[PDB]
């Protein structure tokens, strides 16, 4: 019933594609497509980045994508920017009308 | 546009209770679920469940078990949380956020689709 | 369909036999319905009307 | 239930005393039931007492 496990932090070169993974259990994901991603600049409320595993929200550019597989899921960020230095988080349906919030991972940049 | 407006900061003594609330504006709040989260200043977010504004029904998140209860007042577009027996562990920023659409024929309460967020509010337990 | 997740419990009454009943509808409570395409139903009522 | 939406009101929490594995012992138990099977008790006056 734990938080989704995420890398503490990831990084890469300007222009680099970064993938961030989140892990859970088959009860948490196999059963559901109820997956989303958020990001936040420190000091601000988070922005919703992905709906329904890989769907971009209006306001989210074509840099952001994603997928799910097995007990994990991931976000893909093409075109790494200095501006991506924000925390990224997963969350997903826990089942029984409750929601898992993930541990989160920090973007840092080179 | 969609607004979620919270109270200012507050500080309480251990064992005390605090009301946390938010006003919805710019859209009709009766059509959506309201969810709540916490973020301690060094942590990720913790989730508290959804209040259906129309029914006033709710589901409480695991590790709360009625430690926190939630209420609403539709006449003023306001959602509230009543947080009892505050411990130092409860220091965090509390946020009010809008969830998925609600309809009479299918359940959509678990959906993690938090498009609109309020400003957040500080709850300090001293 | 019936949308609400419903839990179940049982009660032993005297010896042997148990009784079953709903513990509590565990989700949110939404309506019970039957979807039917309009198109096909309005095609049917007229086709029947013709015959 | 909560009342409010008619579709929720119907879920009547129904407490009763039932015979235990020992016939002498009795336990107070509740079962969720809804609408028609639960009938206001004959000759009561809008009270919490019902019959099957
Ligand atoms: C039996 O038959 C009934 C119909 O008689 C049928 O009921 C319908 O069920 C469907 C199931 O999909 C309902 O569809 C949802 O409808 C909402 C309502 O939106 C409408 O109204 C708004 C404005 O009020 C318009 O903007 C919108 O275009 C629609 O006209 C939609 O919002 C839902 O889609 C979204 O939400 C989903 C999650 O809840 C998302 O996964 C999806 O991507 C959509 O997201 C959109 O809204 C998000 C808000 O968070 C936003 O973030 C996204 O970016 C995006 O904008 C969905 O279409 C439909 O309303 C029901 N109709 C009624 C009146 O009951 C039963 O389902 C059917 N039962 C069966 C199948 O047996
Ligand atoms: C609808 O309600 C039923 C309740 O009978 C749910 O089934 C049960 O759900 C619980 C909680 O999800 C499961 O317990 C635990 O699930 C977690 C999920 O990760 C798991 O990690 C724990 O080890 C444990 O399994 C339970 O196993 C499951 N099985 C039962 C009892 O039926 C059902 O999931 C609910 N469905 C929806 C759509 O909400
Ligand atoms: C239907 O009514 C029954 C009561 O006849 C409800 O069961 C009762 O629920 C309350 C609240 O959950 C229980 O109170 C709690 O008791 C535990 C210890 O058992 C205590 O630790 C808590 O702090 C609180 O006092 C009460 O004990 C329980 N009674 C029992 C066991 O029959 C039932 O929840 C109602 N159901 C619905 C769906 O309305």
From TrEMBL, chain C:
<comment type="function">
    <text>Transmembrane protein gp41: Acts as a class I viral fusion protein. Under the current model, the protein has at least 3 conformational states: pre-fusion native state, pre-hairpin intermediate state, and post-fusion hairpin state. During fusion of viral and target intracellular membranes, the coiled coil regions (heptad repeats) assume a trimer-of-hairpins structure, positioning the fusion peptide in close proximity to the C-terminal region of the ectodomain. The formation of this structure appears to drive apposition and subsequent fusion of viral and target cell membranes.</text>
</comment>
<comment type="subunit">
    <text>The mature envelope protein (Env) consists of a homotrimer of non-covalently associated gp120-gp41 heterodimers. The resulting complex protrudes from the virus surface as a spike. There seems to be as few as 10 spikes on the average virion. Surface protein gp120 interacts with host CD4, CCR5 and CXCR4. Gp120 also interacts with the C-type lectins CD209/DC-SIGN and CLEC4M/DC-SIGNR (collectively referred to as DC-SIGN(R)). Gp120 and gp41 interact with GalCer.</text>
</comment>
<feature type="glycosylation site" description="N-linked (GlcNAc...) asparagine">
    <location>
        <position position="42"/>
    </location>
</feature>
<protein>
    <recommendedName>
        <fullName>Envelope glycoprotein gp160</fullName>
    </recommendedName>
</protein>
<comment type="function">
    <text>Envelope glycoprotein gp160: Oligomerizes in the host endoplasmic reticulum into predominantly trimers. In a second time, gp160 transits in the host Golgi, where glycosylation is completed. The precursor is then proteolytically cleaved in the trans-Golgi and thereby activated by cellular furin or furin-like proteases to produce gp120 and gp41.</text>
</comment>
<comment type="similarity">
    <text>Belongs to the HIV-1 env protein family.</text>
</comment>
């Amino acid at each position: 019933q734990s938080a989704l496990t995420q890398p503490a932090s990831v990084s890469g070169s300007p222009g680099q594609s970064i993938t961030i993974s989140c892990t859970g259990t088959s009860y948490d994901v196999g059963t559901y497509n109820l997956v989303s991603w958020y990001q936040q600049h420190p000091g601000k409320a988070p922005k919703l980045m992905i709906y329904e595993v890989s769907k971009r929200p209006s306001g989210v550019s074509f840099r952001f994508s994603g997928s799910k597989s097995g007990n994990t899921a991931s976000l893909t960020i093409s075109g790494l920017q200095a501006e991506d230095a924000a925390d990224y988080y997963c969350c997903s349906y826990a089942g029984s009308a409750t929601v898992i919030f993930g541990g989160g991972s920090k973007m840092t940049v080179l | 546009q969609v607004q979620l407006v919270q109270s200012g900061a507050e500080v309480k003594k251990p064992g005390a209770s605090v009301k946390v609330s938010c006003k919805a504006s710019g859209y009709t709040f009766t059509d959506y679920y309201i969810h709540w989260v916490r973020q301690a200043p060094g942590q990720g977010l913790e989730w508290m469940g959804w209040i259906n504004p129309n029914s006033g029904r709710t589901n409480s998140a695991q590790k709360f078990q009625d430690r926190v209860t939630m209420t609403r007042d539709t006449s003023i577009t306001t959602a509230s949380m009543e947080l009892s027996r505050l411990t130092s562990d409860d220091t965090a920023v509390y946020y009010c956020a809008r969830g998925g659409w609600i309809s009479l024929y299918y359940d959509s309460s678990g959906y993690p689709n938090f498009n609109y967020w309020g400003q957040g509010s500080r709850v300090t337990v001293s | 369909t019936r949308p609400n997740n419903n839990t179940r419990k049982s009660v032993r009454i005297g010896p042997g036999q148990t009784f079953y009943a709903t513990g509590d509808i565990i989700g949110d409570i939404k309506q019970a319905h039957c979807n039917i395409s309009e198109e096909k139903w309005n095609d049917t009522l007229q086709k029947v009307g013709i015959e | 239930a909560t009342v409010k939406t008619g579709t929720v009101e119907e879920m009547k929490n129904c407490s009763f005393n039932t015979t235990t594995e020992i016939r002498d012992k009795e336990k107070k138990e509740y079962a969720l039931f809804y609408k028609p099977d639960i009938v206001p008790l004959s000759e009561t006056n809008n009270t919490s007492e019902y019959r099957l």
